């Protein structure tokens, strides 16, 4: 990814927290270093190549220092619950094409003027219950969206048997009617998908979508056959792929900007972010001011990352150290 900088941003990974400069042996170790006077602050980090230290923070020129949790940075996957509106009819209406249109705004491009429409069709028959209809519709949706041919993942279709309103019975183009032996299906959930990601070339994006229904003649009048309502998401996309591209960008500030450019004549940067983990973050904003005419500020950002075990143990001890060292009182998330 590329981000907007307030004149600079540095990133440092905190894999292990040590208590001395001598204990820095492994490439992810880190120490918050400050003096008893509480006048400056810096971090001693262990790099693939030797120890390094961050720019020194004047503890009187700190603008804000807040630790975000990992939950805050996980993109929630918006999901709808699609049904048929009991005002038109609580059951399918035979001979009518129950079409369903799914619009996609940020398709391959990145604008809202780059749209993409995929469809799902079901023609109803007499004796067709609602469960049978939802089954057939989810199946026709998968075959058109979750196929082995579409260049990109678009949606995750599911089914919910009212006997178990929690479990989201999944569906894919391989799934067949017989694999769905329930009779109390009551909705077609449609959830956005994690798009593919490659470090430093494909930012973590999503394709948002709205389900648009179509008309059916029920008693002589063209009427919409369903109602799409958003429900509280239940699947979140972690920040591993996000911190990783952050590093990729913020490590070209300390180091090389010619990443892989002239392939054999390059500086290969070694990165410590695992894109399969879950990091908390600790961003600290500060500035430097000069002497007696260079009073203009130079705001400079520094952020730290640390894996999350679920209880934020790594970052909590991290800042507890920074607070014992710098007098600050950052809050232990």
């Amino acid at each position: 990814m590329v981000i907007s900088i307030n004149q600079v941003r540095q990133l440092y990974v905190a894999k292990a927290l040590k208590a001395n400069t001598a204990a820095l042996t492994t490439a992810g170790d880190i120490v918050p270093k400050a003096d008893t006077a509480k006048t400056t602050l810096y971090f001693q980090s262990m790099s693939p190549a030797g120890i390094v230290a961050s720019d020194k923070i004047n503890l009187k020129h700190v603008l804000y220092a807040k630790a975000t949790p990992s939950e805050a940075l996980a993109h929630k996957l918006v999901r709808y619950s699609v049904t048929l509106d009991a005002d038109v009819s609580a059951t399918p209406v035979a001979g009518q094409n129950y079409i369903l249109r799914l619009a996609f705004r940020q398709y391959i491009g990145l604008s809202e003027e780059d749209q993409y429409f995929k469809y799902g069709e079901v023609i109803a028959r007499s004796g067709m219950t609602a469960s049978d209809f939802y089954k057939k519709m989810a199946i026709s949706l998968a075959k058109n969206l979750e196929n082995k041919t579409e260049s990109t993942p678009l949606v995750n279709i599911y089914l919910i048997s009212a006997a178990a309103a929690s479990t989201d019975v999944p569906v894919t183009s391989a799934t067949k009617e017989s694999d769905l032996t329930a009779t109390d299906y009551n909705q077609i959930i449609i959830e956005e998908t994690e798009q593919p990601w490659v470090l430093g070339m494909m930012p973590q994006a999503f394709i948002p979508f709205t389900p648009q229904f179509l008309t059916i003649t029920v008693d002589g009048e063209d009427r919409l056959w369903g109602v799409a309502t958003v429900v509280t998401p239940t699947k979140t996309v972690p920040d591993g792929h996000l911190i990783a591209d952050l590093e990729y960008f913020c490590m070209g500030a300390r180091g090389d900007i010619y990443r892989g450019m002239g392939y054999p004549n390059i500086i290969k940067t070694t990165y410590l972010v695992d894109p399969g983990a879950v990091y908390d973050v600790l961003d600290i904003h500060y500035f430097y001011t000069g002497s007696n005419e260079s009073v203009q500020k130079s705001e400079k950002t520094i952020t730290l990352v640390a894996v999350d075990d679920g209880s934020h143990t790594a970052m909590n001890a991290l800042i507890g150290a920074i607070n014992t060292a710098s007098g600050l009182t950052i809050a232990t998330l």
């Binding site: 491009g109 003027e113 780059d114 749209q115 392939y263 054999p264 004549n265 500086i267």
Partner: protein
Amino acid sequence: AGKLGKFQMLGFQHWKGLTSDNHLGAIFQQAPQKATNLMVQLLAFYRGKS
């Protein structure tokens, strides 16, 4: 057979016998041609000058 510079990335390489395009791609002699007479401009109805 050592590093002269500090960021010297390449090393003197050597092979015997039958070669492969892999041998040539491992010594940086195979590159993909860029089709310059080809360009996909994604299509849309651009309602921005309206």
